[PDB]
Structures are given as C-alpha cells and as structure tokens.
Nucleic acid binder design. Structure first.
Lengths: 158, 290, 75, 182, 217
RNA sequence: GCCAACGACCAUACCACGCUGAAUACAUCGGUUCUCGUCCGAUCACCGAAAUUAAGCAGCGUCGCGGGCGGUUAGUACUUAGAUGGGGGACCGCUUGGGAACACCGCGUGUUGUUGGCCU
RNA sequence: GAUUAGAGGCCUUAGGGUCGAAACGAUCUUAACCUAUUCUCAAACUUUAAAUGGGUAAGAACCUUAACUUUCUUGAUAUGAAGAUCAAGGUUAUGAUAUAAAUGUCCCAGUGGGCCACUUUUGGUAAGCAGAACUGGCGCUGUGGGAUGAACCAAACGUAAUGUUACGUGCCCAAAUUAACAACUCAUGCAGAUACCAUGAAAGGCGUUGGUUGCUUAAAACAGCAGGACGGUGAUCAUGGAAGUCGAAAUCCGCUAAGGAGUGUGUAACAACUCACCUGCCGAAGCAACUAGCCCUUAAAAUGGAUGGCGCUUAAGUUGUAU
RNA sequence: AUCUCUCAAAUAAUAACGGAGGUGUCCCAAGGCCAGCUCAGUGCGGACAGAAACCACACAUAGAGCAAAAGGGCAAAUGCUG
RNA sequence: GAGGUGUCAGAAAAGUUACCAUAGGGAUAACUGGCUUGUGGCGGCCAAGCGUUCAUAGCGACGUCGCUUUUUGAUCCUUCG
C-alpha cells in the first residue's frame, strides 16, 4: 500500500550487471570534472556513500560545484508540473561523462573549419544540418542477372 | 565437475591475478582530491627483488602511470658499490640516488641540500622561502609488510636525506625499539653505513672459513675486508651527489625481430591441414588392420 | 465508504493547461551552497583585478629576468 | 597436446631440482577433555619437540561427547627442519617401519598413528601418564614457497606436485620400509 | 472441494508459482506422464503423432488425467500392450484459488462480510497456446490407423479444439524422418533412451576417434 | 622478437593439459648475527650468494572449456497506431510503422601506456 | 527454483542375490552417485533483451589566442583552477510552429462524492461489482446517426441563404424495388437482417455449396440380375464340438481364371448352408476420409408482441463489389 | 507511525482489510582504523576416531558471513583474528 | 539535551436505552426490482462400464460443453420529507 522509503524498488537500479561485480576499476577516481560540465547519473550499487536517489538515476545535468570526492550536479526533476531545478550532491562513481555535447563540440570545430577552407575559396558555407531528404532519381541496370528472381508465396502447408 | 562454473565466474583484475598490486592501496594512494583537479600525486614506489631493488617516482593517470624518474641499485657499481646490493645501506643510496636523479630535472640543486652529514635523525626538509617550495612525495611500498626496520625504509631514508619532502615517522626505521621508544638515532649510523653487515663478518671472521665460503663470499673475490664498508658508503654519498647521468644509452640498435623467435601462432589454414592429415592418419591406422 | 480515494485522472490534463513550465536559463546562478573557499578565493581575485591595460603587459619583462623560463617546464 | 617435444639437450628431466625434500612434520593429540588431561599432553610435546606447543579450541559444541565451543580439547605442534628427520625415525622404530599402504594421502603426504608414547626416547614419568599420538608428515620439493607467498604467488603444476608414488618410492628408497600393500 | 472448472476456463491471471512454505496443499496423483514402452529405443518406435491445440486454452488437470487413461485403453486394446509411447507433453504447474462458502456451524459471526479476502487452494491447471502439442504418441508405422483414431477419443475429453498432426519426425527426435537416416547411417547420431546425439565433432579428437573406431572396428 | 618495475581497460587475458624459453631478467634457491617476526627463519624480517631452469613465469599447441565477435534463426516473436475488421468466445487477420531473443554456424585467443633494459 | 522420461558409466555407495563358507574370485540385478541428454514451467527466477517510453544537447550567454588576477587550500613557470580585460571569427549552426508571449499581485471564486471507455491490470466464481495505470469523454453538451439511450460513431453550437459531407435509398422515411453485378441461403411456432448491443456452446447432418488428401476405373470399375467355393484334413487347436467352422497354437498348400486348416445367423456333432474370389453381365467415371460456407439440430418460461414496424424469400436476407 | 520484495504495466509515481514478511529493539564493540589471514562445502590422509571432534594437504567466485526482516552489496572486504 | 504524546503533525475520557429524541442520509443496512451464480435446478458430446450374451432396450464412470434465477448468497444501482 506504499513505497517509502529511501531505496525501495532498487532491486534493479542498483543491481550490478552480469559479472561486473567487484572492485571498482580505478579510472573512476581519476577523471577530471569541471564546473559547468554536463554529467550523467547511474547510481553505482556497490558504493553506499551518497548514492543518488532513485528519481535521479537516469538523468543528466550540469555540474556546478566540485569538492574533494563528490560533485554537486543540477538535475531537472519534473514535479506537477512545474519542472524544478534540483541541486544534488553525488559522488563520482554515480556519475559518468555525457556524450551529448561531444558530437556537437566536433561539429563546432568543423563548421569553424568548413568555413575556414571556404575562407579561401570564398563560396559557399553550407553549414547547417539537414534531415534526410529524398534520395534522387537514379537509374539502375540489372547488369548482373536480369529480373525474376521472382518471389511468390506458398505459405501455409504445415 | 565444474562446467557451468565457468559461465558465471568473472576474474579479479589482472594484477590481483598476478598478485602484484592490491587495489586497496591503489585507490587510496593515487586519490587526489577532485577539486585540485589534475595536479598529480607523485608518490614513491619502492619495489625490491632478489637481485636488485628499484625506486621510481610516479603519479598515476588514466592511461597507466606516468613516471618522472627511476633509479635502480644496479647503477651503483659506477659509484663504488660493487656487491651487496640489497643491504639496507644499499637500499639507502638508491633512494638517495633518485632524490638527486630527480632534482636535476627540476633544477632544485641549489636548494635543499638535505642532510649532508647523515647520522640517522629524521631531518625532514625545510621549505626554503620566497620561491620554490620543496618537492613532495608519498611512500608506496605496496606488497611488503612494513615491519620495524625493513629494507624499504632506507630507500625512504635515502629520499628524505636526498631532499624530497615526504611525511614519515621513525617507527619503522631500524633500531628504534618500540619497547619503548627509544629515539636511538645512532643505530642508523651503524646501518646506513652498513656496518652491521660488516660486524656480521667481524663476528664471523673468526669462526668458519666456510662461513666465507657461505654468505659474504665474493667480498673475498674483490678483497672487500670487513673494515672499510663505511668508507665505501661514505664515498658513495659524496659521489652520488656528483652526477646522476640518468643512464644514457646509444646502442641504437640490435632489437628488431631477432631471430624469429617465439613460435608464431598457426593460422587456420595450417590448423586445418593438421586436422586433415590427422583424420587421414586415423583411418590409415584403421585401414592397416583391414 | 469506498468509491474513489487516490486517482490520477485529469492530473496531467491539469499539469498541461497552464503548461509544463521549464525553469529558467539564468546567466548567473546562486553560489549558495558551493565550496565556501573556493568562493573566498574568488572573492579575493575579484578585488585584485586591477590592471586593464597597464601592468598586464609588464610582467613579461619580468619573465626575461631568467632570460625567460627554460627550466620550469617540468613542475 | 600436439606440441613438439623435441628434447633440447639441457637435462633428461631428471632431478636437479625435483629433489623431494621433506617439508614439515606436524603433531597433534586429540583427547576429548581439558584441564590436567590437557596440560599433561601439553608437557609431552615441549620435551618431545623443544617447541612450545599450541592448543586448539574445538569448533562447535557436539554434545555427543560434550566438547564445547572454545573448550581447548586438543594440542598440536609443527616441526620444520633438523628435527623432523630425527623424530620420524624415532617414530618409525616403534612403527617397525613397514607401515601399511594408507597412511598415504593422494597429495604425496603420509602420517600414521602410534601408541605408547614413552618409547620415543623418553622416561615413562608416571606423574604424567601415557598419551596416544597421531603423526602427520608433509613432504615437498624445492619450490613450494611459490604457493605460499604474499607477493607474486602462484600454483605449481602437474609436477612439481607430489603424487602418492612420489611419497611411496621415497619411503621405499630411504628408510627401507615396505608399504604393506594389503 | 473438487471445484468445477466451468468457472476456471481462461488465463485470468499471470500464473501462480509454487512456493516453498505452503505445505498443506492437496497432494495429487498426476504423477504419470509417459506410458507405454518408455524404455524402447528410437529404432523401435519411429512414428510420432501429436495432438496439437488451437486456442490459448487453459486446460484443467482433470481433463489431462482422462486424456492419458483414454489413450492407454485403446492402445492396450487395439495396438498391443507395448507398441506405443503415450507422453503428456504438458504439465499442470499452476494454482487455482477457490473462495467457497464453507459457512456452516452458524455462530462465528464475523465470517466474511468483506473481511478478509484470502484465497483458498484446491488444485492445478495447465495453460496451453496455439500450436502447442499436448500429447505425443511415439509408435511404429503399422498402427497409424490405430493411433490417429486413438487421439479422437482423447479430443472429446479436452475443452477447446484440437488438430492432429502426423509428424515428419522420426519419433521423438528433433530430426526429420528422412533426414534422421542420412545423419544416422555412418557415425553421426548415437542412441540414447528415446533421443539421439547431435554432431559429436568439437572436440577434440578422441570423441571423433573412438566413435570412428567402433563404427570401423 | 623480448625483460623488469608501474599500470590502463579487466577472460580475445580465464581454466585444464603438453611442449619450448638466447640474453636481460626474474625466480627457485643458502643462512639466522643484526632488524624482525613466528608453536615452527615455512610464512614474513634481514643477511648473499653455491645450486637450478625442474616449477613459477614467458611463448606456444588442442576440430580443447569458457569467454569475445560475426552471420544467421528473422523481418520471426513481440510492439506504436487505425477500422461500424472477422469470431458465440478464446482469439485471429489486415493496415501503418519500430523489431528482438536462446540456440545454431563461423571467426578471433589480449590490446596497449610511461620509464630503464636484453638482443638470441 | 520447481521438474518428466529414459540412456550411459570404472563404480564399490551399493540392496537383493547368484556361482561361492562369504566371496575378499565372479555374475548379473537393483538402488543411488557421476557423465551427456530430455519433457514442462515461475507475481515475489535470471544470462539476453524490444516497441511505447524518460533525461540532456543542437553556437555570439559561442569558438579559439594572450597575460593578467588570488590571501589560498593544493603548484619551483610562484604552472592548475575559477575569474577581470584585450586579439581573431563569413553566410548563426535540425524541421515545422507562433491563435502573442513573459511576469507580479488579488494564492481572489468554485472544487477537494465522480462516473464511462479502448489497451494494461489486481481482488471475486461472477457482477450494470470492487480497486489502480494511460489516453480520451460524460459531468458542463446541443446537433447528425445507432427505432430507443450521459459516455458509442460522426461532429462541437452567433442569426440566415446556397452548395457539398460518417449513416442509409422497398414503404413508414428524404434517396435505388439500381436500362449495376456474381454467388450463397428454404428455415413446420424466433429463417436472417446495421459494429458497440442487448445472450449461446462442444459434437454433429448421404440438407446443400465449395474445397484438400487417398484410392479404383476404359486389361471396362461402381450398380443390378450367373458359376465355383473344399480337401491334404476327423492331419491340427478345441469334447459345453472341432470333423474347416463358440474360442485356435499353427500351417502350408494340393486342387486351381477363382476354394481360405475357411466367411454367416449368439446354428455343442458330421453335415446343410453361403460369402471372399474370379469370369459372365453392363460399360462412365466411381469410392472414402476430411475440411469450412450458409442452413439445420442443439436452442426450455411465465400479460400480448416485436430485425424498430409492415412486410420480404431470382430478396427488401447474407458475403464480395459497382455506379 | 513506519521498513523490505511483489503488485507496477522496462524512468520515477500508483490503489484495495491485495500477496510474503518486518519494526518500537540490539551493540564499548557488533563503533573507528592499521595489519594479517579467507569462507560454504567437497576430496584424500592420520592412535583411541562411526556422524564422532582434532590435526593435515590439494580443490574451492562467495554456493559462507556480515545483531535482526527482505532486498541489493562485499574476496589482500564490509567477512575472521589480532 | 531530557521527561511523551504508538489514534505516532501530538484532546485528559466508561457503559446502556425495546422508554426514547433531533439533524440528516437512499453517500448506508433489513425490504421489493436490476445485474450476478459458489449454491439451487439443469440437458446434449465421448464411452470405461453395467446390462446373463449383447456397449447405447434401459442406465452410464473420468471428462467436457451449455441452459434457468422464486430461493442461498454476492453486490449496493433505485427508494429512508
């Protein structure tokens, strides 16, 4: 008739994977984390010192205060319905690095550079993305084994 | 037995399988505070072997440890230490060696002369003001029991008498009897000068010639009598402070794919020709009787 | 009695009527609950920012006091 | 398995290092009591070995014989080197050393029971009485410390692991006893 | 007490498992699942005939008791007493909870108004899907008439609707009947209780070797 | 082609067995006076070398176990979405789209970093 | 975590034994145990792992370059970090949207009994019952349609003209008995007829219409009207008879186009007696097991009565379509 | 009033006198920390030695233990001993 | 900091009324009607059988499928001016 409290229904949020138990690999303490960086939260089930609660595992947000061995992240939590900006402290192994900026930061380089090679030829930029267009009009030869190749059913008898 | 054992079993790491690290000091040493983001640790490795001890200063990184400088006891026959390379006193000069093999990289040679008259007192260095604060390091012994007066702490005693600021106590220096302390500094001056190795000979000069056919042989091959061992170890200290030449080598080279050598690994073709004849040999063993 | 205690009908039609209200995008944000120095250090560098044009060039001439900086590339 | 053996001439795989050295001898007395029944068995071993022995507390209260958790029912002591090979031959004359076949664990180890412990070169001493003993001798080879170190440990292999035949030959070879293959 | 199953004909819940503390449950005698010459090898009974279903039916276990004792008592009458293998392919591993009015003795005076609503266990059931065979009869090819007519009299004890496959299998193998023989004829299949062995090749040699030994010598 | 120290990801590294291993090495290995620990110098601790490459370890072998990868089971199972679609009901079919999984067959057997070092 | 079935095994755990005084010599057997399988599963089991989803990002609040700043805790550039001012920056960095958005106050009124529905779902045997998840509705909502109706399907509503649309066109009832079709269906006390929806089963049916598999047949099949049908052998099993025959171990053949130790009446012997069979006869298709359409049977309730009504039956029923 | 697994429909939330349980305490160590050692069990051995203990060598991915419910978690620990 | 409110956001609190009362309630029972069927009552499919012999003249085990709601309940839809 309940949940309440603080770690309920975490038989699979903080379960370990198949055979990734054991000593946490030591790169997790070695990562550098800055202020304003973006970060994910997967609560690591083998470290009880300040897990995120279950309402923040899965959620990304911006660091804005780093300490000795934990980080104070800003995670958007939807309440009803006024989305709040939370201010969560978590440790390091309950955090990963985002990748969602990482593609864009290589798009900022190239749009700086696709205009840089076009700095000399002049024209023209064509910087912004497009979603998938229709392909074109082709024509395709068989050329290579003319048609039929002809699938026709016979699908029951069984 | 033990077949679905293997589907579920996963392995302790690599260097807990080899038995080399411990990963319970490794987390706790190399932890820097995550607000002093990337300024490294600079710990001090001391690893010892049957032949030759090893001291490297290093700091870990994501991609394996970086190493700033390393110094082995095998370099010591340059400086007059011919045999007896795993003494405590032979461990002293190696930790003395990197503590001058590294300050040339920083140019910290005008400052922090260190305990130039070594006698066995805990002369942690002083930060000489208006500029360069002293180099910092922390001891990493790893997998040796830190018992009272082990060989690994003379290497530490080499470094703090070299000039590197390491926090340490004396409770694992030799001869500081914990019943009860007994800040007896002078037993270092008998150990860091190696004299109790010599006084082991002076208490064995008289009993057995076969004792010299036993342990501390080959001092007899070099005529190393049991009297002048300090005079070796005094001379090293003023000669290690001459030139740590960092072991430059210009062979360049005889290394490449000599000679084959180690039994390359049989691709699938010649695997199949091995199986093709073996199946042909077994029917040939069967066609023999018929 | 027992007809309807604890339902969610009409609860996201309400929450999507005066709608779902993203927070903000504030240029500056509160440093309330940050590391408390850190912030006393930045409160000391905020006062000592004195050179806009004047001393900001001058200390390069002080770098040449060691004919530059050949040595300190290490630590 | 299908690796070319080819016998590069360094050794015939003889014994330069497989030399089958006796590792240790461990002693024990399992007497289901304590007190003077304990400490008289304790002062058996201090003169029999020259090492001060250790007791052993019982594991769990079994109540079939009323031994209890931490009751110290049993005494045991280990002997390594320069005292095993004299105590065992003392224990072998009373054994009249044609000892039965098992007596031989499959890991190359062998131990035996004895009675009437006075005949191990000691006085009868009626103040302490008699005490029945079990012996157990563990043999080894040069190299087994690899199994038992803190730093770079590791197991051994198919050989240097001792088979039972390595323990029966070595008992047939020296000490000249037959194994009484019943 | 022996509740009718006009009231229990569908998959109405996600299925009850069998706990390990609730002992006091009724002990059934649905303990028999294979009948006939269960010990005969694959070479003795090559014909296999299933009784395949047509709904997501939930079968009672009363019906499955009747469906085996019906097909036994034609095949011990019209097939010879050993020439077959009736096999239930379908186990009744569920619980049904029966809140019946055992409300005699008339003075407990709180019995249930709606207080409380615990269930009460009085048997099993067996759930079925479309195209899931319920019984399979492994026999010889001679009694093909005697078995496809034996299963008609097993239909009329089951609810729902059933369809009667004669297989292209070679008995209870996973193999097709002709494809059984081709893989059998040299070394590649091995006899067992009522089944075969599947490509004993990898590895490494001796299993290839010794199974090649006895087929040679 | 290697070795040591220190690692990273943590089985393509693991396990079993068998073979080989120049040099650098590592070990194995000798001792108990000191430091030092032990019921026991086995473990640790400290001293230094006679022996050995047996074993560790390293490299490999095996239609090996496992684990890794790919095809394939499969446009399958399931599933968003739609109908005044079928059926007595279970349930099914169609349309619009997303689309797995065991098994099975194949193919791989660690890759690498920093620092010294050997060079068969 | 339940769990069916057998297979293999030196075994020495072996239970009966057995050849043996026991066997310790050995034999199988049976129980386990071990090995490789196998049947079926699981709200409180997982190796694997969807769709529907949840989070964040998508540029000037940017991108680099510089030397400055700091008391510091960390650092020999008194480097890192976080900042304050300069230098360079192309065309502003997915799509489509903007009935205006942003923000205070009055946290002002009312409300804090909900019901219904798809798909999901728990308790109950069920319930127009009970309780939840999602979306949409009713409440508050008229109009068109479903004869009828709070929620169904269309559609949301200022006063009017004109024209054009989900349901229907035999008559009530606007518009087809279609100068459009093929078929299916006979229903003797309810033929059947607009999804929700107003109840219906399993199994049938030589009613009929289609089918899928199996035969036999033009060396003339099926259908109807001829012939022969025992002996070797009362060898044989059966004596309540076996002699061919209640029930048969067997067991062939001889005779021969075709006759079997034999096919028949609830015929105890012989025997009568007929089938099987063949050919005559006629000569075109025939026989059977299925399968699913409508129809039928199943199918039983109290005032008199309901495809909504009449009525309909090469339809005004049902399925597929057309103007 | 409160906790755990399930219901719960792969974020989190979700109900009924739905299902299985728990709590109102216990601990100067069962808190801290540094070092050392590894557990369930099985296997072969050893006087009195079966189920008897205890010594002893190999195997042993947690099948042990962690005050207590249940769930996660832990192997040079968070377990055992100092 | 402590002493405690366990109805745990925390009044200090025993019964009876068939002698009764008021405000109301169909937000709520007993009562008809409705929906429902564990119970009631119920007829076909398949035959293990019984039926001397003989399955179905007459019955018909284990199954299985449907039918009625005046009781028994189940609910709480309608009514407590």
């Amino acid at each position: 008739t309940n949940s309440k409290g603080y770690r309920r229904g975490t038989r699979d949020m903080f379960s370990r994977p198949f055979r990734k138990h054991g000593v946490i690999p030591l790169s997790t303490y070695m990562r550098v984390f800055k202020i304003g960086d973006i970060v994910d939260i997967k609560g690591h089930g083998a470290v009880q010192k300040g897990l995120p609660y279950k309402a923040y595992h899965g959620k990304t947000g911006r660091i804005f205060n780093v300490t000795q061995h934990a980080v104070g992240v800003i995670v958007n939590k939807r309440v009803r319905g006024k989305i709040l900006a939370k201010r969560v402290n978590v440790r390091i192994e309950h955090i990963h690095h985002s990748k969602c900026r990482e593609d864009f930061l290589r798009r900022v380089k190239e749009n700086e550079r696709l205009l840089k090679e076009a700095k000399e030829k002049g024209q023209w930029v064509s910087l912004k993305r497009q979603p998938e267009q229709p392909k074109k009009a082709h024509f395709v030869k068989k050329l290579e084994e003319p048609i039929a190749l002809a699938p026709i059913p016979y699908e029951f008898i069984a | 037995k033990n077949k679905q054992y293997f589907k579920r079993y996963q392995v302790k790491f690599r260097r807990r399988r080899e038995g080399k690290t411990d990963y319970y000091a490794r987390k706790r040493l190399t932890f820097q505070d995550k607000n002093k983001y990337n300024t490294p640790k600079y710990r001090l490795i001391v690893r010892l072997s049957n032949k030759d001890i090893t001291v490297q200063i290093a700091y870990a990184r994501i991609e394996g440890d970086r190493v700033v400088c390393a110094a082995y006891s095998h370099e010591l026959p340059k400086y007059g230490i011919q045999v007896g390379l795993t003494n405590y006193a032979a461990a002293y000069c190696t930790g003395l060696l990197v503590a001058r093999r590294v300050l040339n990289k920083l140019g910290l040679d005008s400052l922090y002369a260190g305990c130039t008259e070594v006698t066995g007192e805990e002369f942690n260095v002083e930060p000489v003001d208006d500029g360069p604060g002293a180099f910092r390091c922390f001891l990493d012994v790893g997998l040796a029991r830190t018992t009272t007066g082990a060989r690994v702490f003379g290497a530490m005693k080499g470094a703090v008498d070299g000039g590197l600021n390491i926090p340490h106590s004396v409770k694992r220096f030799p001869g500081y009897s914990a019943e009860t302390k007994s800040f007896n500094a002078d037993v270092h001056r008998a150990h860091i000068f190696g004299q109790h190795v010599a006084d082991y000979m002076r208490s064995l000069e008289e009993e057995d010639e076969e004792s010299f056919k036993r342990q501390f042989s080959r001092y007899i091959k070099l005529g190393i009598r049991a009297d002048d061992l300090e005079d070796i170890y005094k001379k090293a200290h003023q000669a290690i402070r001459n030139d740590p030449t960092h072991k430059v080598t210009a062979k360049k080279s005889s290394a490449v794919t000599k000679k084959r050598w180690n039994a390359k690994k049989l691709t699938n073709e010649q695997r199949k020709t091995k199986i093709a004849a073996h199946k042909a040999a077994y029917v040939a063993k069967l066609q023999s009787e018929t | 009695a027992k007809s309807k205690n604890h339902t969610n009908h009409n609860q996201n039609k309400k929450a999507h009527r005066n709608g779902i209200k993203r927070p903000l995008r504030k240029r500056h944000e509160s440093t309330l609950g940050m590391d408390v120095k850190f912030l006393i250090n930045q409160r000391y560098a905020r006062k000592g920012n004195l050179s806009r044009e004047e001393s900001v060039k001058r200390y390069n001439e002080r770098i040449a006091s060691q004919k530059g900086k050949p040595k300190p590339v290490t630590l | 398995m299908a690796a070319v053996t080819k016998k590069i001439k360094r050794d015939p795989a003889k014994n330069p290092m497989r030399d089958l050295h006796i590792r240790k001898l461990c002693l024990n007395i399992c007497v289901g009591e304590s007190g003077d029944r304990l400490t008289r068995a304790a002062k058996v071993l201090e003169q029999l070995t020259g090492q001060q022995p250790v007791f052993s507390k019982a594991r769990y209260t079994v109540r079939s014989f009323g031994i209890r958790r931490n009751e110290k029912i049993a005494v045991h002591c280990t002997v390594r080197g320069a005292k095993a090979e004299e105590i065992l031959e003392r224990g072998l004359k009373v054994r009249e050393y044609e000892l039965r076949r098992e007596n031989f664990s499959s890991t190359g180890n062998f131990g035996f029971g004895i009675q009437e412990h006075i005949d191990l070169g000691i006085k009868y001493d009626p103040s302490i009485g008699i005490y029945g003993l079990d012996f157990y001798v563990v043999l080894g080879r040069p190299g087994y410390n690899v199994n038992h170190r803190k730093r770079k440990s590791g197991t051994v292999g198919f050989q240097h692991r001792l088979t039972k035949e390595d323990a029966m030959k070595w008992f047939q070879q020296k000490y000249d006893g037959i194994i009484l293959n019943t | 007490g022996r509740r009718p199953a006009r009231c229990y004909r569908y998959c109405k819940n996600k299925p009850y498992p069998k706990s390990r503390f609730c002992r006091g449950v009724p002990d059934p005698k649905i303990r028999i699942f294979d009948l006939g010459r269960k010990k005969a090898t694959v070479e003795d009974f090559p014909l296999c005939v299933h009784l395949v279903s047509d709904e997501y039916e939930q079968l009672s276990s009363e019906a499955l008791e009747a469906g085996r004792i019906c097909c036994n008592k034609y095949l011990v009458k019209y097939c010879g007493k050993d020439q077959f293998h009736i096999r239930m392919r379908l186990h009744p591993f569920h619980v049904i909870r029966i809140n019946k009015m055992l409300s005699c003795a008339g003075a407990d005076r709180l019995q249930t108004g709606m207080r409380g609503a615990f269930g009460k266990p009085q048997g099993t059931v067996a759930r079925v899907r479309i195209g899931q065979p319920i019984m399979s009869v492994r026999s010889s090819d001679r009694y093909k008439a005697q078995v496809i007519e034996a299963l008609r009299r097993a239909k009329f004890k089951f609810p729902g609707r059933q369809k009667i496959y004669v297989s292209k299998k070679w008995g209870f193998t996973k193999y097709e009947r002709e494809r059984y023989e081709e893989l059998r004829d040299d070394n590649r299949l091995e006899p067992d209780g009522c089944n075969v062995k599947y490509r004993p090749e990898h590895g490494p040699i001796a299993a290839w070797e010794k199974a090649q030994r006895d087929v040679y010598a």
